[PDB]
Design a binder for this molecule. Structure first.
Ligand code: NI
Length: 207
């Protein structure tokens, strides 16, 4: 019914969430999964958080992405308050007021990567490749493991994703017929539950 993970909390803070879980009989786990229903984020007073992997995967799977104030207020009032009333409005990176968690929360039909084939290509830091893959797949993309495995034809849209920053890559276009973009395309996209124009993120390709 209800199952939670937390992100960006101190053990103290995590204690409080546990106490909360025990009281109301909510499930509490270390990892985010299919079933995870809530993601409790540390925010500032205006519900702005760091963007963590759990933050990303919460949005991606249209979860309840709620401020830690949901917890503390609910304890203060010996009652579970409105998940509605505490949602994260943004993150450092994507601005303090974009409201993507709620976007995603409802838009579970109009999924931002509906109709996409994505190949997370090469090496990534600060994020397991398979978690990035899960993420885009949660957003209605089809994952592809090899540049040479893209489905040819049309009406379909392949996309190569890379992290140039972690790039020890302008020559990928030589090996396929797809746009090449940064991981930031995906991450900004997911954070806003809004599919971004590649323009910004495109990596230029050698003939
Ligand atoms: Ni098209």
């Amino acid at each position: 019914r209800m199952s939670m993970v937390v992100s960006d909390l101190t053990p103290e803070e995590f204690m409080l969430v546990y106490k909360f879980a025990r009281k109301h009989h909510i499930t509490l786990t270390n990892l985010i999964t299919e079933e995870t229903t809530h993601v409790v984020m540390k925010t500032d007073a205006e519900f702005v958080c760091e963007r963590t992997l759990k933050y990303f995967l919460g949005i991606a799977g249209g979860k309840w992405v709620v401020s830690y104030f949901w917890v503390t207020q609910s304890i203060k009032e010996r009652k579970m308050l409105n998940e509605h009333d505490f949602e994260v409005r943004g993150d450092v990176v994507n601005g303090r007021n974009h409201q993507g968690p709620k976007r995603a929360r409802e838009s579970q039909d109009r999924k931002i990567f509906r109709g996409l084939e994505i190949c997370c290509y090469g090496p990534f830091t600060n994020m397991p490749t398979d978690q990035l893959e899960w993420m885009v797949q949660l957003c209605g993309a089809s994952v592809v493991k090899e540049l040479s495995s893209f489905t040819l034809g049309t009406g379909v849209h392949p996309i190569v994703v890379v992290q140039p920053d972690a790039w020890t890559f302008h020559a990928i276009g030589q090996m396929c017929e797809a746009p090449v973009v940064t991981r930031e395309w995906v991450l900004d996209s997911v954070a806003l539950y809004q599919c971004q124009e590649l323009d910004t993120y495109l990596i230029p390709q050698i003939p």
